[PDB]
Design a protein around this ligand. Structure first.
Ligand code: CL
Ligand code: MG
Ligand code: MG
Ligand code: MG
Ligand code: MG
Lengths: 244, 233, 211, 240, 250, 222, 231, 235
């Protein structure tokens, strides 16, 4: 019967690892690097688009940075199509919570929900897992500014600074070196771009090969503003920090 | 739940020494309209059973098809279908009785009253009633609808109890049935003169008589009846 | 029907009549309205006999699997609640129940009223049935906590008698039960006919009745 | 639906998927449980390969199932969340139907049953998780400590450890823990729990988490400084 | 019976590759060349009508398809897979948008819905990925003109101009030299015809080329008058004669 | 509107002796003012020394009896041909009845036999499965005519010993099978006189350790 | 070899190996004998024990008052099939007030076993059955194989060493068929038949199991001291 | 790979035969049936001294008149016990009586072969079901994952089974007392166990008509162990 052709996606190896999760992580390690840095007065999200073309319409393009709601955003590393499936689920979950409790969803609760979905594909159903790793950047009134990451295993952890995708080993070392607790957003912006500039596989880091975003309390009085940077604005911040 | 539309009236029957007799008129009424005059309401099953049905005719036609299918199904992988493993009156009845009670228990009944008349393998007479409620009973005489009220009294004068059955011949039993059918024609407003009669004997087998008519009727005395009390002319 | 139950220092008394009626006709007069659920648990019957008996036997089953799974006798609160939740599924569907779950657990003697309408009430004194209203008068006036077991049994017996006399649909005989921490003890079947004349003479009550 | 039998017997009478789930537990960070005379202490290892971590928001290793019961684990982190959620739902369901909080033994029996169910159900793999469940029964002052594993078996322990290098810390506990006289106070119990982790942990900095559970729903998690004081005192006595 | 293939047929290999998606992309590579170019006042999509037989009526086989009045699509790869995707794309534009908002979806969201369908064939049980890459050109009020590519993985990218299929690498190089941000629609059509001639071997005329545009509103193609706000479809398929006229000025 | 229920009349009576039991019932079947049958058996031998009668709506009665007989058959299959005790049968029948708690069997059922100590046993049921053990119990149309007479002549209610004047009750002396059948016959003869649905015939089933015996007696046919 | 992984796969020579392996389980099972005359039908079964402390596994199952069988192979599979027969016999009685014909009972077992041989996921039944019964056409004996094949016979035997008993019955055919109105002599012929399949062990009081059905004889099983008469 | 419900060429179900190998690895359990009662005893086999041995529950009550001992993958037994308890209590609900030990055992054994591609594999545990009823008296059954159950006068399952069964072969007779059976289980357990038998690593139980199913205290068993040592030293 059909058993003959079943790959068995949800099984342990003799060493106690999940084959497909490990291979999904291998896939993600070839994806464009995405970096998240948390400061006292905001969060930075920086990400590298993969070998683009001159004919790609950049200003209407979105492959890395996505908006989940007004307070929470994500950086993607892996299969974009898989990520969009999950992103739409997360958007719906945030709205369900808002409808139920009449309050914006706490960041961790949203993260846990998505991570539980990822976990389900590793334990039952016989389907391949989502080949995606997220960096969640968000704010709420309980814990303030938060950075999380999730991977195809469905495991998630909190961070002060973190990278996903390609060259995370090198990137995480560079972040661990220059990061300090009393750091500010403008400094974190500089750190993120400098780290990408050193870890990139490209010859030089340019505006057309980047997506950038910030979550700031730099909004008029006690409230939070999401800023998805435009191509021209990424070009300006690259000059300001002294990379181009 | 429904209501009956095209209906058939009384079915009457009785046991005699060597078998059973059953009869029913050929009318299919549509309320007070005597719509269909060529309706057969006695349906033979093999050469040993006759099922007489009253009530809703569309449900009768459904039952008629179930019995036809029952014969077909019994013959499947059955080398003794025309001998030891042929359908018995008791098998046919119990099947119908099961269906009728199940249908009432789903609040969607077959709006009928049925009498299964026949002779068993061992020669025993079979005569049992069943209706839309799944209610079953047996008796030396059985009748449905108006027949219960008018025919049974006449038929019970011939066979009042079990011990009168061996003393009753086929000629006497048929005479009583034919007389009962005349009485029902006098008094049942939903009856017809034309009827069918079936005899199932353990010796002579199944005799099915069609196109019978009520005869030897008394009407002459009507000429002398004038007015409703005081009128003389 | 008349059923009652009450908590007191030495446990809980349970009493009931035995009459069953079909309109004005008395179908039976030997009905067991005190339901022996298990050796440490009692229940009462009022409203639908079938309903009360069936669901409380189905409860006994639940209470026993509990005792197996957990190696511990179920509490009166948990027992009453399993019953209440079970009958709550069939709310508005026709069930007629009015029961009292009587027992002794870690919290001491326990008594819960449970009905098909959805109520579940802990209390020290209950009486349900068409004759409840006659029984309450005698209970409320003589009920204490420092009640001797001998006196408490008589009270529950006298309270049923009061109802059996006045209520047409209550009568027959009185069944008595006493629940201890060591389990329940049956205290007999008492014909109301004989009991009435006895009580009238010894007590002086029912003066208006000629005997 | 996906019905495939993943957990099946092999010729030698082994269910490899269940045994491979134990290997995932062996990879997991070390967790330890020690019960004193009037308390239970749960210790957990945090691997220091991950720095730049936000310790405020990162999922804690010890999870409250109810106000009187806690659960720690070793193995796949994602898998543990599913067991904890189920356990928490059951704890509220028990209070709702029976009007009493779960006993520690009951809660352990439930979680162990879930783990077992995933070893003979079609289309699913076993949980790569072993748990330590600790607490106090309602209106009881006897400490309770249980352990579960992927196969579904569970048991009670005076002291126990699971996860990576659990063999070493179990060795330590077996010679240091006396049944006739267990840790009489909270200090003694925590000290023994920290001592045991120091055999394996590496640095006694932010790598050790301690959670003390006392009777009547009195649960508290120690801070870095409080733990660091234990680490200091232990090694100063060791220099002799 | 019952579909007993409830497990994924596309899975990660040790290297992290999703084999079936790669192989689907290989099928797209073998397919006939198709392209899209975006102008300031329109978009053009074009491809070769590779006739399997001269007895076959190639007019009956439409490689360029209308999805909505303002959105069109062309493909490279497996024809039958494209045909069913067009049927689904047309339907989803109604069920998940028009029946809700009373208007046709913007290009990017329709593309998003098609991409979702293709992604699910890459993860769901007992199916293979679609063996096509789509080029979807469209217009909507708030986003203006746009051109998107959709791959077997479900990934989609917006383009100023691009090509897919047989000679895509050469064609994309040709487009990079010719494209600018000041092109008029007629200039884009001219460049489309030049680019497409390089990948075509045999006959090059209006009967062997299929070409459509997203441009100005066509009130003559609406089918009714009386509602000022309804001005007609922006999608228009060029005729055989209209193509040949522009091949003389080539 | 379709009424799924009916009333086939009939009356039944179960009396429990010291080492025997009887279950009697008339043989008349009726609808409204018509007679369907003068002899339609209503009391049945169900096996394992148990007799049963489901009085009221005949279609529901026939179904319940049929199901219980089936239940006895499967009890033998499932439990190594073990004899179904009268108390076990009673509890089983409760569950058969309550299975249709929201579309009941419109019948008042009575069973009779011997308990596990060999003593006579009768059990009565209501339409939804409430059951209870009894010594003397009539069911059906003329139950109210019969039971007051049995209260007086079996249990000796309201009867006191002459000379004492209400101080000493008449003692509850055990009755023989012959004495019981006399009371049964006189009960049905009296019911036949004053109830129109009672008559034609009377069939009694007697249960002893030796087995199940039948007795039939004619009743008035008017 | 490569075509025995499941029941849904024919071999190149048109064989179904999973069915053949199920057939093999019957050959490993203990011997049982079936035979009939024109008035009665008899089952004789050699029961098997695990050891001296263990009981002897029951081989004969009653299906109705007029029908029953003996088993050889996987006992749980016999329990499933006998339960099915019990239900079918019972359906015939409740609905049609009709005792189920033995031939039709065979047709029903054949069809139930067949469905397990043509579908994926399931397995064939691992048991052989000898059905005896008395119906409206007299006494009957059937042999059921889990391939689906059901065969009406005068006599037969299945299980380990069953060929010896089958040869004996083939010689005795003309004699035992004529044993009408004599149950004890028909059982004797069955006990003598099953004795041809014995080696080392002999028929003891808790070893032997006998069943009979006939004209005025309900299906009854004899075990223990009830079969000492025939030893 | 291959079907879960596949027959081997010899006519055996692969998975059932493989589950039997898992049972051979399990701790020893012994049952002895007498006319005064049935005794059930088990080896606890704690994997560490820190493990509180009284939490090891390998002997279990099904009803007041039926007890049960297990050997093999003990986690698999929990749902079997649960079904057995439900079956016992449900029969009491339907029939107002205790359920026959054989009928209970049959109900448990019906679950056994409900596996395929229902549960995904057979049970990896064997059960000794001991009890009493009025019809067949004191009984001991051995329930396997094959769906087969044999009645036994005495039976041992687990790692030391064939050695213990040979010992039970010689020692059992129809006139054994309850006290004699208790010592006999302790004797054979002490023989096949790796560690030295005491009240903490071994457990006794019995089922009598009067008192029903009882698990023995460690103090009660300790005395029976001391009584055993003295009687073995007596000759
Ligand atoms: Cl066998
Ligand atoms: Mg007529
Ligand atoms: Mg409940
Ligand atoms: Mg009164
Ligand atoms: Mg009259």
């Amino acid at each position: 019967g059909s058993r003959r052709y079943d790959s068995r996606t949800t099984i342990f190896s003799p060493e106690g690892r999940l084959y497909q999760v490990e291979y999904a992580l291998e896939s993600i390690s070839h994806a464009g690097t995405a970096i998240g840095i948390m400061a006292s007065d905001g969060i930075v999200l920086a990400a590298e688009r993969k070998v683009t073309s001159t004919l790609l319409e950049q200003d209407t393009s979105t492959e890395k940075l996505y908006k989940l709601n007004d307070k929470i955003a994500v950086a993607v590393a892996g299969l974009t199509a898989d990520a969009e499936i999950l992103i739409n689920t997360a958007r719906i979950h945030a709205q369900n919570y808002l409808k139920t409790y009449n309050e914006d969803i706490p960041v961790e609760i949203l993260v846990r929900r998505l991570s539980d979905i990822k976990q389900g594909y590793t334990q039952h159903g016989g389907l391949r897992p989502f080949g995606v790793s997220f960096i969640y950047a968000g704010y709420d009134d309980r814990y303030g500014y938060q950075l999380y990451t999730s991977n195809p295993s469905g495991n998630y952890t909190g961070w002060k600074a973190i990278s996903v995708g390609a060259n995370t080993s090198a990137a995480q070392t560079l972040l661990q070196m220059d990061y300090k607790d009393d750091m500010k957003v403008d400094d974190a912006i500089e750190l993120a771009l400098k780290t990408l500039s050193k870890t990139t596989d490209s010859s030089a880091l340019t505006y057309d090969r980047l997506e950038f975003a910030t979550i700031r309390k730099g909004a008029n009085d006690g409230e939070v503003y999401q800023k998805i940077f435009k191509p021209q604005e990424i070009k300006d911040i690259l000059v300001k920090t002294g990379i181009t | 739940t429904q209501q009956p539309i095209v209906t058939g009236t009384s079915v009457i029957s009785m046991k005699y020494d060597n078998g059973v007799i059953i009869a029913a008129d050929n009318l299919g009424s549509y309320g007070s309209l005597l719509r269909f005059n060529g309706v057969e309401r006695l349906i033979p099953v093999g050469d040993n059973t006759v099922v007489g049905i009253s009530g809703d005719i569309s449900d009768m036609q459904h039952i008629e098809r179930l019995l036809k299918d029952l014969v077909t199904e019994n013959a499947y992988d059955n080398p003794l279908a025309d001998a030891e493993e042929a359908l018995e009156p008791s098998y046919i009845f119990e099947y119908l009785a099961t269906v009728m009670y199940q249908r009432r228990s789903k609040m969607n009944p077959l709006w009928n009253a049925i009498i299964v008349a026949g002779v068993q393998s061992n020669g025993d007479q079979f005569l049992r009633y069943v209706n839309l409620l799944g209610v079953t009973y047996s008796s030396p005489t059985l009748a449905t609808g108006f027949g219960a009220h008018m025919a049974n009294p006449l038929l019970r004068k011939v066979v009042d109890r079990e011990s009168d059955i061996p003393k009753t011949t086929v000629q006497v039993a048929e005479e009583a049935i034919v007389n009962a059918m005349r009485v029902l024609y006098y008094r049942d407003a939903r009856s017809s003169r034309n009827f069918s009669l079936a005899i199932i004997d353990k010796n002579t087998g199944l005799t099915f008589k069609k196109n019978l008519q009520v005869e030897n009727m008394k009407w002459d005395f009507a000429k002398d009846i004038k007015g409703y009390g005081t009128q003389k002319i | 029907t008349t059923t009652l139950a009450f908590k007191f220092r030495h446990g809980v008394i349970v009493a009931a009549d035995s009459r069953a009626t079909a309109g004005a006709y008395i179908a039976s007069q030997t009905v067991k309205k005190v339901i022996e659920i298990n050796p440490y648990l009692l229940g009462t019957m009022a409203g639908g006999a079938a309903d009360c008996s069936f669901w409380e036997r189905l409860l006994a089953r639940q209470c026993r699997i509990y005792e197996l799974r957990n190696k511990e006798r179920i509490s009166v609160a948990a027992a009453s609640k399993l019953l209440a939740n079970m009958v709550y599924q069939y709310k508005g569907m026709g069930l007629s129940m009015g029961t009292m779950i009587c027992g002794w657990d870690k919290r001491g003697p326990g008594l819960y009223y449970v009905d098909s309408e959805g109520n579940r009430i802990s209390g020290a004194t209950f009486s349900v049935g068409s004759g409840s209203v006659y029984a309450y008068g005698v209970l409320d006036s003589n009920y204490k906590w420092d009640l001797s077991v001998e006196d408490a049994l008589y009270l529950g017996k006298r309270s049923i008698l009061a109802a059996a006399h006045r209520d047409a649909y209550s009568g027959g005989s009185v069944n008595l039960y006493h629940v201890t921490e060591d389990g329940w003890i049956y205290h007999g079947n008492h014909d109301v006919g004989e009991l009435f004349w006895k009580v009238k003479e010894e007590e002086g009550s029912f003066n208006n009745v000629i005997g | 639906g996906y019905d495939r039998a993943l957990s099946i017997f092999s010729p030698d009478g082994h269910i490899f998927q269940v045994e491979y789930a134990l290997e995932a537990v062996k990879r997991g960070t070390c967790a330890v449980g020690v019960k004193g005379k009037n308390c239970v202490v749960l210790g957990c290892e945090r691997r220091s390969t991950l720095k730049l971590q936000d310790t405020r928001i990162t999922p804690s290793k010890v999870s409250k199932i109810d106000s009187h019961v806690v659960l720690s684990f070793s193995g796949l982190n994602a898998d543990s969340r599913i067991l904890i959620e189920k356990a928490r739902v059951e704890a509220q369901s028990h209070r709702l139907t029976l009007e009493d909080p779960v006993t520690v033994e009951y809660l352990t029996r439930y979680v162990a049953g879930v783990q077992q169910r995933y070893t003979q159900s079609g289309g699913v793999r076993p949980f790569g998780v072993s748990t330590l469940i600790a607490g106090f029964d309602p209106r009881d002052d006897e400490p309770k400590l249980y352990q579960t594993e992927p196969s579904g078996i569970y048991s009670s322990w005076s002291a126990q450890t699971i996860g990576r290098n659990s063999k070493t810390v179990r060795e330590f506990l077996e010679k240091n823990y006396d049944r006739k006289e267990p840790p009489a106070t909270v200090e003694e119990c925590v000290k023994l729990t920290v001592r045991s982790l120091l055999e394996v942990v590496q640095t006694g900095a932010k790598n050790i988490e301690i959670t003390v559970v006392k009777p009547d729903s009195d649960i508290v998690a120690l801070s870095s400084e409080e733990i660091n004081q234990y680490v200091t005192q232990i090694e100063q006595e060791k220099q002799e | 019976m019952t579909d007993r293939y409830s497990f994924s047929l596309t899975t990660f290999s040790p290297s992290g590759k999703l084999g079936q998606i790669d192989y689907a992309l290989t099928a797209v590579k073998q397919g006939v060349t198709s392209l899209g170019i975006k102008a300031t006042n329109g978009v053009v999509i074009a491809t070769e009508k590779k006739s399997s037989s001269p007895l076959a009526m190639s007019e009956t086989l439409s490689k360029v398809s209308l999805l909505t009045p303002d959105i069109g699509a062309v493909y490279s790869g497996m024809g039958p897979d494209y045909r069913v995707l067009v049927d689904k794309s047309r339907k989803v534009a109604h069920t998940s948008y028009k029946r809700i908002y009373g208007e046709y979806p913007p290009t990017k969201l329709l593309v998003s819905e098609v991409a979702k369908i293709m992604q699910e064939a890459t993860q769901s049980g007992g199916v293979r990925p679609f063996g096509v890459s789509l080029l979807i050109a469209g217009h909507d009020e708030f986003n203006g003109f746009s051109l998107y590519q959709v791959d077997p993985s479900g990934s989609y990218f917006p383009w100023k101009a691009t090509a897919i299929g047989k000679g895509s690498v050469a064609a994309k190089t040709f487009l990079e030299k010719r494209w600018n941000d000041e092109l008029e629609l007629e200039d884009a059509i001219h460049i489309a015809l030049l680019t497409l001639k390089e990948s075509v071997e045999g006959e090059f005329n209006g009967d062997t080329i299929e070409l459509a545009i997203i441009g100005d509103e066509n009130p003559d193609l609406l089918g009714y008058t009386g509602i000022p706000t309804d001005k007609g479809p922006r999608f228009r398929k060029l005729t055989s004669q209209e193509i040949n006229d522009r091949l003389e000025a080539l | 509107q379709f009424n799924p229920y009916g009333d086939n009349g009939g009356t039944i009576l179960g009396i429990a002796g010291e080492d025997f039991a009887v279950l009697a019932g008339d043989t008349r079947n009726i609808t409204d003012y018509s007679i369907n049958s003068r002899y339609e058996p209503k009391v049945f031998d169900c096996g394992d020394n148990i007799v049963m009668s489901a009085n009221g709506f005949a279609a529901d009665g026939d179904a319940l009896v049929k199901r219980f007989k089936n239940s006895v058959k499967w009890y033998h299959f499932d439990h190594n041909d073990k004899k179904l005790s009268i108390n076990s049968a009673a509890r089983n029948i409760q569950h058969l009845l309550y299975s249709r708690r929201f579309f009941p069997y419109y019948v008042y059922n009575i069973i009779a036999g011997l308990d596990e100590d060999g003593k006579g046993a009768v059990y009565s049921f209501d339409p939804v499965g409430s059951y209870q053990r009894e010594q003397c119990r009539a069911g059906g149309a003329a139950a109210s005519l019969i039971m007051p007479f049995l209260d007086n002549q079996v249990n000796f209610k309201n009867q006191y010993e002459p000379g004492t004047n209400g101080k000493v009750k008449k003692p509850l002396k055990y009755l023989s099978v012959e004495e019981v059948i006399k009371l049964v016959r006189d009960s049905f003869t009296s019911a036949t006189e004053r109830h129109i649905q009672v008559g034609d015939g009377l069939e009694i089933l007697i249960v002893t350790k030796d087995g199940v015996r039948k007795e039939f007696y004619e009743l008035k046919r008017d | 070899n490569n075509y025995d992984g499941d029941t849904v796969t024919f071999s190149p020579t048109g064989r179904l190996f999973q069915v053949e392996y199920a057939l093999e389980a019957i050959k490993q099972g203990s011997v049982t004998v079936g035979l009939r005359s024109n008035t009665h039908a008899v089952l004789v079964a050699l029961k098997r024990n695990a050891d001296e402390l263990s009981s002897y596994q029951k081989k004969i199952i009653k299906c109705d008052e007029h029908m029953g069988l003996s088993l050889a192979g996987l006992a749980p599979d016999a329990r499933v099939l006998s339960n099915y027969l019990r239900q079918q016999c019972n359906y015939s009685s409740l609905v049609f007030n009709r005792k189920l014909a033995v031939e039709r009972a065979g047709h029903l077992l054949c069809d139930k076993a067949q469905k397990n041989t043509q579908s994926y996921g399931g397995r064939p039944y691992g048991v052989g059955l000898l059905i005896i019964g008395y119906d409206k056409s007299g006494a009957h004996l059937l042999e059921f194989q889990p391939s689906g094949n059901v065969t009406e016979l005068y006599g037969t035997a299945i299980g380990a060493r069953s060929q010896g008993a089958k040869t004996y019955l083939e010689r005795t055919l003309d004699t035992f068929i004529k044993i009408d109105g004599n149950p004890d002599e028909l059982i004797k012929a069955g006990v003598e038949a099953i004795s041809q399949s014995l080696r080392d062990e002999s028929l003891t009081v808790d070893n032997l199991s006998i069943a009979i059905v006939g004209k005025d004889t309900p299906f009854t099983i004899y075990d223990g001291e009830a079969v000492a008469k025939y030893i | 790979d291959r079907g879960v419900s596949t027959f081997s060429p010899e006519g055996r179900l692969f998975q059932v035969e493989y589950s039997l190998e898992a049972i051979k690895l399990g701790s020893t359990a012994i049952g002895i049936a007498t006319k005064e009662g049935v005794v059930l005893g088990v080896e606890k086999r704690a994997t560490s001294p820190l493990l509180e041995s009284d939490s090891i529950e390998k002997i279990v009550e099904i009803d007041r008149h039926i007890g049960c001992a297990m050997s093999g993958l003990t986690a698999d037994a929990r749902s079997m016990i649960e079904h057995a308890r439900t079956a016992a209590v449900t029969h009491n609900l339907y029939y107002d009586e205790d359920i026959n030990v054989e009928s209970l055992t049959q109900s448990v054994c019906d679950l056994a072969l409900r596996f395929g591609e229902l549960m995904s594999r057979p049970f990896g545990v064997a059960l000794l079901i001991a009890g009493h009823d009025a019809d067949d008296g004191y009984q001991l059954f051995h329930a396997e994952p094959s769906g087969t159950f044999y009645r036994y006068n005495a039976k041992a399952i687990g790692s030391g089974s064939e050695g213990a069964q040979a010992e039970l072969l010689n020692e059992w007779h129809s006139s054994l007392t309850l006290k004699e059976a208790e010592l006999l289980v302790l004797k054979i357990l002490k023989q096949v166990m790796e560690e030295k038998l005491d009240e903490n690593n071994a457990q006794l139980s019995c089922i009598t008509k009067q008192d029903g199913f009882k698990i023995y205290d460690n103090e009660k068993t300790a005395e029976l162990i001391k009584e055993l040592k003295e009687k073995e030293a007596a000759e």
